[PDB]
Amino acid sequence: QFNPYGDNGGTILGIAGEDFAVLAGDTRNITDYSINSRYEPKVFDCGDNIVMSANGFAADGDALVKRFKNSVKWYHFDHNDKKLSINSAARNIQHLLYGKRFFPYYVHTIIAGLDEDGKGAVYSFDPVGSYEREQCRAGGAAASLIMPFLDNQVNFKNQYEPGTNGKVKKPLKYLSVEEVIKLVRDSFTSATERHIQVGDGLEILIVTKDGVRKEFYELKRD
Amino acid sequence: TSIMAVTFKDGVILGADSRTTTGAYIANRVTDKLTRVHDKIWCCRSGSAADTQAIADIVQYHLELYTSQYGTPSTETAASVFKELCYENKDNLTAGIIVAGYDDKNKGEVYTIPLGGSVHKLPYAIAGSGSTFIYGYCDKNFRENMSKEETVDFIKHSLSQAIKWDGSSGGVIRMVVLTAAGVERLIFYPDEYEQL
Amino acid sequence: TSIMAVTFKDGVILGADSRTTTGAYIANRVTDKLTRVHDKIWCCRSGSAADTQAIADIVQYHLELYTSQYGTPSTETAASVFKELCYENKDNLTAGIIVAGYDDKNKGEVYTIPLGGSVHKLPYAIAGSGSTFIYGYCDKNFRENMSKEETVDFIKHSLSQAIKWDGSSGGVIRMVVLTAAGVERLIFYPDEYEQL
Amino acid sequence: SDPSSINGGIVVAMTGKDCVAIACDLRLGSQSLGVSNKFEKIFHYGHVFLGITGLATDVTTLNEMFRYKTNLYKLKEERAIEPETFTQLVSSSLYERRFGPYFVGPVVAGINSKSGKPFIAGFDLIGCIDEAKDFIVSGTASDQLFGMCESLYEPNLEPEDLFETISQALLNAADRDALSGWGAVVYIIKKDEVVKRYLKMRQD
Amino acid sequence: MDIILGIRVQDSVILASSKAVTRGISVLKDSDDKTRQLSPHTLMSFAGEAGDTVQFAEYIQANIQLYSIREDYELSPQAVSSFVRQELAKSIRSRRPYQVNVLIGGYDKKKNKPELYQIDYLGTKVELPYGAHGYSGFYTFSLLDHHYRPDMTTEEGLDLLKLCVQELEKRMPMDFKGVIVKIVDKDGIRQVDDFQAQ
Amino acid sequence: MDIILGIRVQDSVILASSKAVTRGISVLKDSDDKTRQLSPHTLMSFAGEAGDTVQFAEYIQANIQLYSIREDYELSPQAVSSFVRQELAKSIRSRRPYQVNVLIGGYDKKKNKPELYQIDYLGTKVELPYGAHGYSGFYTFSLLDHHYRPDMTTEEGLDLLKLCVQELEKRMPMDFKGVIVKIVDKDGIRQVDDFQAQ
Amino acid sequence: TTIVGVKFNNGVVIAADTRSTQGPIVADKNCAKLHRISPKIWCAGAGTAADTEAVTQLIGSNIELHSLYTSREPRVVSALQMLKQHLFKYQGHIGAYLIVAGVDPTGSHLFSIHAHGSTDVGYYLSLGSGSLAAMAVLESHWKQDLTKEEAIKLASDAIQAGIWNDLGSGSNVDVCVMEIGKDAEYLRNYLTPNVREEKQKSYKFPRGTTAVLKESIVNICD
Amino acid sequence: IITX
Amino acid sequence: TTTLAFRFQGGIIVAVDSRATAGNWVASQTVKKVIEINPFLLGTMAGGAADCQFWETWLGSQCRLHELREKERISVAAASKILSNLVYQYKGAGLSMGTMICGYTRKEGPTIYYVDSDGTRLKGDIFCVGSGQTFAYGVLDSNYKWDLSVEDALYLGKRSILAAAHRDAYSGGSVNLYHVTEDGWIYHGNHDVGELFWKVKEEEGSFNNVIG
Amino acid sequence: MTDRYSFSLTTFSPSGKLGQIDYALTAVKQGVTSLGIKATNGVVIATEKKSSSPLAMSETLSKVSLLTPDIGAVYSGMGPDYRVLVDKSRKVAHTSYKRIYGEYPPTKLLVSEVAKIMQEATQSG
Amino acid sequence: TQQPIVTGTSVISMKYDNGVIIAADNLGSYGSLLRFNGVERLIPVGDNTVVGISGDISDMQHIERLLKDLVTENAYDNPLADAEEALEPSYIFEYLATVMYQRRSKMNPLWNAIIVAGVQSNGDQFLRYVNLLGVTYSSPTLATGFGAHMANPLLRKVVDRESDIPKTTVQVAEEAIVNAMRVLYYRDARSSRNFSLAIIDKNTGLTFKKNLQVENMKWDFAKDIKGYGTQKI
Ligand SMILES: [Mg+2]
Ligand SMILES: [Mg+2]
Ligand SMILES: [Mg+2]
Ligand SMILES: [Mg+2]
């Protein structure tokens, strides 16, 4: 029978800093065992200081991203050029997603940006709309690999303060963009070591009040 | 079902066996699988008898109304009608049809619409269960611009083979000759085609 | 797979293509599907590679032992061994085999063992996926007591057609000539058979 | 139905500077129901350690089997079995049941008493042997562990350091897995001595 | 399913087991004893498929009884259980596995300590302060996780079981018709004849 | 299933219905009223699929109340039932049939006689001395076939129901948590607040 | 997994990649796919990891014993006939796909065996998920009368095709050259083009980070 | 589809 | 999941855990399972994440509209029946949600309704819902008493979630407490099981099936 | 038909001697000398090649046999009984050891295995 | 809810320094019957685009029709139809992409895999793929069916990344394309020897070659093979 779905691999990761947030994703696109492209971006700038990626079935991810940008276009039109805050973009997406609850967009999406107060923000969605704001989150194939790492290296879980008989948690400080990028790169190299779908390249979108900056690093191509 | 259509210098000839079966029973041993959709536009039918009759009947109508309004239709048009029907309704149909007709400017023409409803124009075409057995013979014994007498033979032999190996084919061999000279109905009996 | 065996005045020739596939991939395009079970008793193999290799390997053995003990085995006997294996193990084998060999008293002989394990002795035989296509041609172009040269052609043409139509056949055409003169190995490349 | 996902649990072993470490979680449950907070999965026959994750009944069964096999070995050979060798025993013992396997994922860790080089290995349920220089992971949280290890790991760490690493690797990987956790244990292995430490961890 | 709970206190093991045997639409009996004494200080409770249940229990009984005689000695609880586990673990890969789950409560005369072991039809065994098979565990483990203390008296354990029983009667869908309680301690095994109302 | 019994005495109809709502592994409530008053002299008891149950009940209630007002009259019990039957018989061939079973017990003020109708989710209706839906009938019909008399008093009927309940508490596997009884007679509808202990 | 064999003027060489997978996860980044059946008879295997090793050890064992019993060096057709017959007996349940090559008193040989027990012979062969990327190359650059040097390259490249274009392959390339006169040479990790780049940060946790409950020493001797 |  | 709400002297207690799972994968431990509808109405979630979040945020809207339309605050009964009737319309499509609508109104007083995707809507004083419900009931039922002090109530609801968080693999993260009174809901914190378990063990002396 | 010789052929004599065993030892006495000397860094085993004719080719007979690549054997007695003891010895080195531990058996164990084969011929039927 | 019937195999393509090349054979297979031997599957749209299609032929034929109409309707009230407002490769592709994903979402897909190759108004090469599920992607090389397996590895050894495109010549590229084509004839049981190739160069414009054949074939070595192992002659 016709199977309306497929899996194009890839993995994406988002991290929110104090006055920035990043949304990185690998650049490989596959099908079964073949590499479709070594460079096919899946993290995009949607205007209004909002980056989004919908990773999973590319057709769906693409459709989703398209419908959202457009939702941003019409938000401007219908509401006199008002800027779509990230919280609002999020809720909008929930609806985009949940509209297809009975023939889902087989994707795990994330958007990053700055909140109304200027602090970094990341939001992630279940293929049918569940969402929440978070400090960091990875999605896609190597999600299971990368996520634990971030809980540890970003949120300092299980790390306590030396010589306290494990009764005092490590001070929850906030990483700098530089450190975040180091983590992003490691999380990705690691993921490429162990996942056959992850590799080829890593594209990170950094978001600050100064707009959106793009950084690109090569990954293993095997 | 064993059907073929072969164009030649004077036009084109349509040929077919005459067996209809429900499984292994021969429902009708003297069927006519060569059907007219226009004065000089005929088709060879194979697959579901219901479906093909249904399709032919509709094409005849479409062409009849076409005639009244815009005059004689080209074979290529008769083919697009069939195509349209077969493609658009691909899920509910089992009809492989060969369309062939004679025209003054285009001489003879043969179009084949297989199960998917795609259309193919060729010097001749063969279709039906029994076809598989003559792909070799036919590819070996067909030359363009043959003569009526020659083409009658090529068809006669190719079908006889088909009738020999395929149990789903048999009966008599019917042919339809389409030239500027008109329309002639040919029939060949077992006692003649069998020991060829 | 496309294989056949043709007896003639001087003996018999076995012909086959050289394609092995796993679906639509060509595993090996230069396979040898003509296998010796005895000095002048060979078989054409079609179906599962494993099954047929396995079977052939065993028939060779049984025949070798037959030789040591009771002398040179008839072709008929080669066939019986094959039949035995194919019939007695029908539920686990996908093998259609053609057995042909040359002998001084019997001249050339061909036995075909289809899927059910039945055995049939015939002037010639064809089998393999590509065979359906040449039933017509072969039944039309085959006469008895042909000459080596003629027989080589008939096989060459028949298989060329089979290779043309069937996507499961291809490569080169291998033949094996078996006469009192011995055993000759023939091969024909695509660039020659294709445009025949 | 998936034998490998009924009871839950994980094991991981790494190699350091003249040491190895192997740790595991203490959980044993039946699907959602946590049943035992005291189920260790690391065993040792002399100075060779074997951790096993998978269907608890099989875990237990194979331990028993390897004790037996190691014991006899010692009586016939008159020396304790070595890691390199035990690994081969495990492999063959697993492949013996190729078409009705024990649903487990063993991990071997230890230090050859002769050469002193640290050694660890892992196997699939039918015996494929994976001898690695860095780390071996197994269990319901295999992916997570592969994630922690691949990143956290770095060559030739001293015992005291490797401990932290292996521990954080296990700990954090467990927390992202429902079927694992409920306590953890780490073995630090050195020629002379071996230390066993229990870890405080989320009890959910 | 039927109810099977066990709780090891300081000086004894208390096994409580439902008295109902139901088949289809009717409760066939309301006084069943889902227990067999393996040896004078070892009791085993069981639950599972229809016949397998008693059949397995009686078989393990015979075997332990035979050993006791052949050696004029009483295997330690730990011993009986391992034996039991092995009989199950070998059964899971047989033609028709015994579909039985058991709790084994014994008083180890040598160590002078009570013990309770839970082993499922797969041969999954583990030693515990208290345990249960079936759905019962799904309410009782949390309950016991909260009210249990290692130094409890046999009386205290009975009261705790009571709680367990009341909760099960309150929330479980099936009427299991109450339980039969038994205490395994230094002096052997005795049935609390007063639990239907204590 | 849940229990729905109804018994028509000489001057009334007594409906008894179980107080439990269980979902999966837990009894969520032990005081459910599986009944709706269609009109002052007509009560309907219902059981079946989780939601369809109350939804169908309340819908039928609304419709009967509306008619009551549009005509300032109370439809005869027989009328209310035929109405209910047709709603059911139409449902059985819809996209998603109401999977509900009902007993309607009403006092026909014109004929001055109590009535009881049993209707299944397929719109199968029948008038009876006593009826039940589910598995309960499997026990009660024979019990009633034996202990029932046409000239019983409201009190005698209640005692008869008591027998029924007891038999059910004895032999049914599920703890349905008792019943709520209601009597429909000339003076209306009242709930026997004293049945948990009479 | 990606394996090949290429016969040359005075011998035959084989190569294979070094990636093993448990689904989409890389189990072993450097397993050994080349197996010594006898000193001068090697086999490259793909399919079920344990089967290829098991069937290889088994036949190698029986081969060693046949050599000793006959006082002769093992022949490839023997390993070939034994593998085939074993695999065939198992109706494909032993998922071993192998390229068996080596030199013996009768010359140089190159064959392939499929898990159902069918065998092939050729001048170059490949098998594995990477079979197509490799064969493509082989069909592009092979020619008769290759030197040891040319064949090694040919084989090496083919494996590279797989490493690169097949997710079911990766890491390094292993070669075994079996030349008619000389001792067979096994070049383990002939090529290593997938070396992981230096990590950005070091996660050496400060000692004391982990919370320990109770500590004790283990007894290792008797 | 996340669950709870 | 694991959620409870129970009624008593000082109001209603609503405690839920905060774990989100994708099978055995722990998707998150920071999910709010309580949606604050209006200052006197709480809705708890269990089942599909989206289904609950979505339809309950929606419920919130329909509640507001009612305010605008009737000037009166929506009752818990009505608030609940909206969700319920909504859900019943989708019956047979696969919605998965089990929830409780707790709230206080001058007319009804403290009130709790359980509404699930099967369309069952019920009123009661104690409901535990979710994969860990049995675990919660176990603890809850045994120590629950009507004359409980607000402080003890908080603790009990809290403890029950703790319970389930421990035993049920599918529950965990942290407990979120809410007190609903005559004057509205009062949030009583987010407690990380990671630390709560240990504190409770030491202070209470339970969970002895663990050492530490 | 069938090996009905199911009883021991080596029994105990009233003096405690196992006849057939003492006798085989005699056969051993009658055979050519073979010796073995062990050094600190090696071992040597030697024997004489009793060419049973100058027409026979001495080389086509190994009295000294390799059991594993680190173990050798030489004898004195009835040659054939040896040859087959070698076969079995080489085979058991695999079946009971290389096929299980992936390394060749140590001498004492392989010895122990050969030994067992022989004992059984002292008791089996 | 369909199942392809008459089909066409791979379509291969790669982009070079000043253009793109694409090719596909001329076969319409009917299962294992190589039925039709004169099927062009490379569809030229205007002067700067060629769209190669593999999959079910009847649907391809339908896409042919959709493409002609797309052209007809762009001429309409378009004074700049043969210039500034002419159909660009990207326009054609996005249209087709859109249709594919809409047909998949309706559960009645066009059973094809399509590559649109061409060059844009401003000179940029354009090469992109879309298939029956609406999945789309782009690369210096692209192929469908077997070509993805066999051709891509080959075509990529020439252009492994973007930077290699400006260093690659038409000659190099076309050579590659024809070899890959040859390979496919050897290993794809559904390939044919006859094929069509087309180049779209930013200077020479669109060159479309019909009736090419696989040549330089190595089959001679087949003579030294006999048996499947132990056979001698
Ligand atoms: Mg790769
Ligand atoms: Mg062909
Ligand atoms: Mg795993
Ligand atoms: Mg966990």
XYZ file of N, CA and C in Angstrom, chain J residues 3-119:
351
model
N 27.025 -54.737 16.622
C 28.085 -54.959 17.595
C 27.439 -55.440 18.878
N 27.337 -56.748 19.035
C 26.753 -57.292 20.238
C 27.810 -57.408 21.331
N 29.037 -56.982 21.032
C 30.118 -57.018 22.007
C 30.003 -55.821 22.925
N 28.990 -55.878 23.771
C 28.700 -54.807 24.702
C 29.344 -54.882 26.075
N 30.205 -55.869 26.306
C 30.854 -56.066 27.608
C 32.312 -55.742 27.545
N 32.914 -55.477 28.693
C 34.326 -55.157 28.724
C 35.142 -56.337 28.187
N 36.236 -56.048 27.487
C 37.122 -57.092 26.994
C 38.395 -57.100 27.853
N 38.492 -56.138 28.763
C 39.597 -56.006 29.699
C 38.931 -56.120 31.062
N 39.125 -57.244 31.754
C 38.532 -57.468 33.083
C 39.610 -57.532 34.165
N 39.245 -57.909 35.386
C 40.250 -58.018 36.442
C 40.560 -59.497 36.642
N 41.843 -59.794 36.778
C 42.273 -61.160 37.002
C 42.321 -61.291 38.509
N 42.282 -62.527 39.027
C 42.316 -62.708 40.474
C 43.491 -62.112 41.217
N 44.515 -61.664 40.501
C 45.700 -61.069 41.129
C 45.694 -59.550 41.062
N 44.597 -59.011 40.537
C 44.448 -57.574 40.403
C 45.047 -56.995 39.133
N 45.372 -57.845 38.181
C 45.945 -57.334 36.969
C 44.950 -57.251 35.859
N 45.118 -56.196 35.086
C 44.284 -55.949 33.953
C 45.107 -56.497 32.809
N 44.820 -57.747 32.490
C 45.537 -58.448 31.451
C 45.838 -57.681 30.197
N 44.791 -57.370 29.443
C 44.943 -56.659 28.192
C 45.799 -55.411 28.324
N 45.800 -54.782 29.483
C 46.628 -53.605 29.653
C 48.108 -53.989 29.748
N 48.429 -54.985 30.570
C 49.820 -55.408 30.699
C 50.323 -55.866 29.339
N 49.480 -56.600 28.618
C 49.837 -57.086 27.292
C 50.139 -55.947 26.310
N 49.260 -54.950 26.217
C 49.507 -53.826 25.320
C 50.856 -53.242 25.673
N 51.153 -53.150 26.962
C 52.435 -52.611 27.387
C 53.577 -53.462 26.830
N 53.352 -54.766 26.667
C 54.386 -55.645 26.108
C 54.597 -55.236 24.666
N 53.498 -55.077 23.933
C 53.556 -54.654 22.530
C 54.399 -53.382 22.477
N 54.195 -52.505 23.447
C 54.971 -51.278 23.523
C 56.464 -51.582 23.668
N 56.815 -52.515 24.548
C 58.209 -52.912 24.746
C 58.889 -53.340 23.448
N 58.154 -54.069 22.614
C 58.647 -54.572 21.332
C 58.853 -53.514 20.251
N 58.343 -52.307 20.465
C 58.476 -51.263 19.458
C 59.725 -50.419 19.548
N 60.057 -49.771 18.438
C 61.237 -48.929 18.340
C 61.304 -47.866 19.420
N 62.515 -47.478 19.767
C 62.738 -46.477 20.784
C 62.330 -45.074 20.314
N 61.864 -44.262 21.255
C 61.532 -42.870 21.020
C 61.815 -42.275 22.380
N 62.280 -41.044 22.409
C 62.586 -40.420 23.679
C 62.236 -38.959 23.624
N 62.379 -38.303 24.750
C 62.102 -36.900 24.802
C 62.935 -36.351 25.921
N 63.533 -35.211 25.661
C 64.359 -34.573 26.647
C 63.818 -33.189 26.681
N 63.726 -32.644 27.873
C 63.204 -31.316 28.042
C 64.364 -30.410 28.426
N 64.477 -29.242 27.797
C 65.538 -28.261 28.086
C 64.909 -27.080 28.839
N 65.667 -26.027 29.123
C 65.085 -24.885 29.834
C 64.324 -23.981 28.880
N 64.779 -23.954 27.629
C 64.169 -23.145 26.592
C 63.749 -23.989 25.391
N 63.260 -25.198 25.640
C 62.809 -26.046 24.544
C 62.597 -27.504 24.926
N 62.118 -28.318 23.992
C 61.940 -29.740 24.243
C 62.192 -30.428 22.930
N 62.731 -31.633 22.998
C 63.011 -32.373 21.800
C 62.462 -33.756 22.007
N 61.906 -34.320 20.946
C 61.360 -35.662 20.987
C 61.922 -36.280 19.757
N 62.433 -37.488 19.902
C 63.056 -38.148 18.787
C 62.739 -39.605 18.743
N 62.974 -40.183 17.584
C 62.737 -41.579 17.391
C 63.464 -42.001 16.137
N 63.499 -43.299 15.902
C 64.169 -43.856 14.741
C 63.144 -44.184 13.673
N 63.527 -44.063 12.408
C 62.648 -44.385 11.292
C 62.997 -45.776 10.820
N 62.289 -46.749 11.362
C 62.526 -48.131 11.013
C 61.952 -48.415 9.632
N 62.654 -47.958 8.602
C 62.233 -48.179 7.216
C 61.998 -49.691 7.014
N 60.746 -50.093 6.829
C 60.424 -51.505 6.642
C 60.754 -52.099 5.263
N 61.653 -51.433 4.524
C 62.134 -51.830 3.184
C 62.885 -50.657 2.550
N 63.925 -50.934 1.738
C 64.652 -49.825 1.109
C 63.867 -49.382 -0.120
N 62.795 -50.113 -0.413
C 61.931 -49.775 -1.523
C 60.835 -48.823 -1.083
N 60.645 -48.733 0.221
C 59.653 -47.849 0.785
C 60.308 -46.491 0.990
N 59.510 -45.430 0.893
C 60.006 -44.069 1.047
C 59.784 -43.574 2.469
N 60.875 -43.493 3.221
C 60.849 -43.076 4.624
C 60.063 -41.802 4.956
N 60.188 -40.792 4.102
C 59.525 -39.497 4.279
C 57.992 -39.540 4.380
N 57.365 -40.486 3.679
C 55.905 -40.642 3.663
C 55.362 -41.326 4.916
N 55.903 -40.947 6.059
C 55.483 -41.542 7.294
C 55.989 -40.629 8.391
N 55.069 -40.021 9.119
C 55.477 -39.167 10.213
C 55.236 -39.906 11.518
N 56.321 -40.313 12.164
C 56.196 -40.967 13.450
C 56.028 -39.843 14.455
N 56.590 -38.680 14.148
C 56.439 -37.528 15.015
C 55.324 -36.709 14.373
N 54.303 -36.377 15.159
C 53.150 -35.628 14.672
C 52.868 -34.347 15.449
N 52.350 -33.336 14.743
C 51.988 -32.058 15.361
C 50.551 -32.215 15.795
N 50.255 -31.861 17.036
C 48.893 -31.960 17.530
C 48.272 -30.558 17.452
N 49.045 -29.546 17.831
C 48.614 -28.161 17.748
C 49.899 -27.463 17.343
N 49.850 -26.171 17.012
C 51.109 -25.524 16.627
C 52.134 -25.331 17.757
N 51.846 -25.858 18.943
C 52.757 -25.742 20.083
C 52.910 -27.106 20.815
N 52.430 -28.190 20.211
C 52.504 -29.489 20.844
C 52.761 -30.582 19.842
N 53.698 -31.459 20.196
C 54.056 -32.570 19.344
C 53.991 -33.869 20.110
N 53.890 -34.966 19.361
C 53.806 -36.300 19.925
C 54.617 -37.333 19.150
N 55.213 -38.273 19.880
C 55.998 -39.353 19.293
C 55.607 -40.582 20.094
N 55.822 -41.760 19.532
C 55.427 -42.970 20.230
C 56.392 -44.138 20.074
N 55.915 -45.299 20.525
C 56.625 -46.567 20.434
C 55.518 -47.563 20.644
N 55.248 -48.412 19.664
C 54.188 -49.377 19.843
C 53.617 -49.769 18.510
N 52.314 -49.964 18.466
C 51.671 -50.323 17.218
C 51.304 -49.040 16.492
N 52.110 -48.688 15.493
C 51.892 -47.489 14.710
C 50.438 -47.141 14.394
N 49.672 -48.022 13.730
C 48.281 -47.689 13.429
C 47.494 -47.127 14.633
N 47.569 -47.785 15.783
C 46.862 -47.307 16.960
C 47.255 -45.861 17.230
N 48.464 -45.487 16.844
C 48.959 -44.129 17.061
C 48.320 -43.171 16.094
N 48.446 -43.486 14.820
C 47.892 -42.648 13.778
C 46.500 -42.230 14.189
N 45.633 -43.188 14.504
C 44.282 -42.826 14.882
C 44.218 -42.100 16.187
N 45.229 -42.216 17.017
C 45.199 -41.489 18.265
C 45.532 -40.062 17.978
N 46.302 -39.844 16.918
C 46.705 -38.490 16.519
C 45.468 -37.756 15.977
N 44.773 -38.404 15.039
C 43.559 -37.870 14.430
C 42.681 -37.356 15.575
N 42.231 -38.285 16.402
C 41.398 -37.957 17.531
C 42.042 -36.883 18.373
N 43.350 -36.940 18.575
C 44.008 -35.932 19.406
C 43.933 -34.548 18.804
N 44.084 -34.460 17.499
C 44.036 -33.176 16.842
C 42.609 -32.664 16.832
N 41.669 -33.552 16.577
C 40.280 -33.157 16.566
C 39.820 -32.656 17.942
N 40.077 -33.407 19.003
C 39.643 -32.998 20.335
C 40.294 -31.693 20.803
N 41.425 -31.335 20.217
C 42.117 -30.105 20.594
C 41.257 -28.925 20.165
N 40.416 -29.185 19.176
C 39.509 -28.200 18.630
C 38.172 -28.297 19.342
N 37.448 -29.380 19.105
C 36.141 -29.559 19.691
C 36.040 -29.236 21.176
N 37.002 -29.655 21.994
C 36.914 -29.376 23.428
C 37.724 -28.203 23.875
N 38.222 -27.424 22.936
C 39.001 -26.297 23.363
C 39.115 -25.080 22.464
N 39.637 -25.209 21.248
C 39.732 -24.018 20.407
C 38.343 -23.497 20.053
N 37.394 -24.405 19.836
C 36.036 -24.034 19.481
C 35.250 -23.469 20.648
N 35.882 -23.320 21.799
C 35.183 -22.819 22.961
C 35.889 -21.653 23.581
N 37.213 -21.694 23.581
C 38.008 -20.629 24.173
C 38.781 -19.815 23.130
N 38.778 -20.257 21.883
C 39.484 -19.500 20.870
C 40.997 -19.510 20.933
N 41.545 -20.423 21.737
C 42.995 -20.633 21.873
C 43.226 -22.141 21.955
N 44.432 -22.591 21.632
C 44.729 -24.020 21.670
C 44.879 -24.475 23.084
N 44.576 -25.746 23.342
C 44.686 -26.291 24.695
C 46.102 -26.342 25.196
N 46.278 -26.253 26.508
C 47.633 -26.324 27.039
C 47.978 -27.822 27.025
N 49.269 -28.150 27.027
C 49.724 -29.537 26.954
C 49.055 -30.516 27.914
N 49.127 -30.242 29.208
C 48.533 -31.138 30.185
C 47.094 -31.484 29.901
N 46.329 -30.505 29.432
C 44.921 -30.719 29.146
C 44.752 -31.515 27.898
N 45.508 -31.194 26.860
C 45.395 -31.978 25.645
C 45.820 -33.420 25.982
N 46.857 -33.539 26.813
C 47.366 -34.841 27.248
C 46.230 -35.562 27.948
N 45.644 -34.853 28.897
C 44.553 -35.353 29.670
C 43.470 -35.836 28.744
N 43.243 -35.129 27.653
C 42.200 -35.559 26.736
C 42.587 -36.830 25.999
N 43.846 -36.936 25.557
C 44.308 -38.140 24.856
C 44.210 -39.311 25.797
N 44.725 -39.084 26.993
C 44.713 -40.058 28.067
C 43.318 -40.631 28.227
N 42.324 -39.756 28.342
C 40.949 -40.210 28.507
C 40.519 -41.133 27.376
N 40.937 -40.825 26.158
C 40.547 -41.653 25.037
C 41.039 -43.044 25.236
N 42.283 -43.149 25.688
C 42.905 -44.446 25.917
C 42.257 -45.246 27.051
N 42.013 -44.593 28.178
C 41.364 -45.239 29.305
C 40.085 -45.881 28.847
